[PDB]
């Protein structure tokens, strides 16, 4: 239950960087990117779980993640709204 951040693989971060337009990727990128992604997911899942707590539910709906991302100024379309 600790190698789940390693599930964000080196090919997957490379594909993401290719979509971002990156030509060359140093080796120290990948651990840093796993870290930054983990911090972003910490903030988002923290807010979404807070919203789940307020609704007295046990499951996290997609509307909760939409409301969380909307609160954090990154509005997401296509999941209700």
């Amino acid at each position: 239950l600790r190698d789940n951040i390693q599930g964000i693989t080196k090919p997957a971060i490379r594909r993401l960087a290719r979509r971002g337009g990156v030509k060359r990727i140093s080796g120290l990128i990948y651990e840093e990117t796993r870290g930054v992604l983990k911090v972003f997911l910490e903030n988002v899942i923290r807010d979404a779980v807070t919203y789940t707590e307020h609704a007295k539910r046990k499951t996290v709906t997609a509307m909760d993640v939409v409301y969380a991302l909307k609160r954090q100024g990154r509005t997401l379309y296509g999941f209700g709204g």
Binding site: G21, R74, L76, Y77
Partner: protein, 111 residues
């Protein structure tokens, strides 16, 4: 009553519902009083923005030789327009990706 029930959308020459906009302005807890010019005007604004974006998205569907607007076509429609980019710069559209943007210094020197 004995009258033809002409809806406020058709009365204003619009398509978006003035009644649903009006009861969302009432239920949405924005003010005590909500007029009729406010939901008429707001349905007009929303119809115009929906019209312009679906227009540009049909254009990008035509360019992609398709007759069904996909998320990618909305993505291209918003991000290739400057003012829609200013409107939705802090907004993620799902299943859209990004624009095909490649910087000039990353290209090989084909001279």
């Amino acid at each position: 009553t004995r009258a033809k029930a002409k809806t406020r959308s058709s009365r204003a020459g619009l398509q978006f519902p003035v009644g649903r906009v009006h009861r969302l302005l009432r239920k949405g807890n924005y003010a005590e009083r909500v007029g009729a010019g406010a939901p008429v005007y707001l349905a007009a604004v929303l119809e115009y923005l929906t019209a312009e974006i679906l227009e540009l998205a049909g254009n990008a569907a035509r360019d992609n030789k398709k007759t069904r607007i996909i998320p990618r076509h909305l993505q291209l429609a918003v991000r290739n327009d400057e003012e829609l980019n200013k409107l939705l710069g802090r907004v993620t559209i799902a299943q859209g990706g990004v624009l095909p943007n490649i910087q000039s210094v990353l290209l090989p020197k084909k001279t």
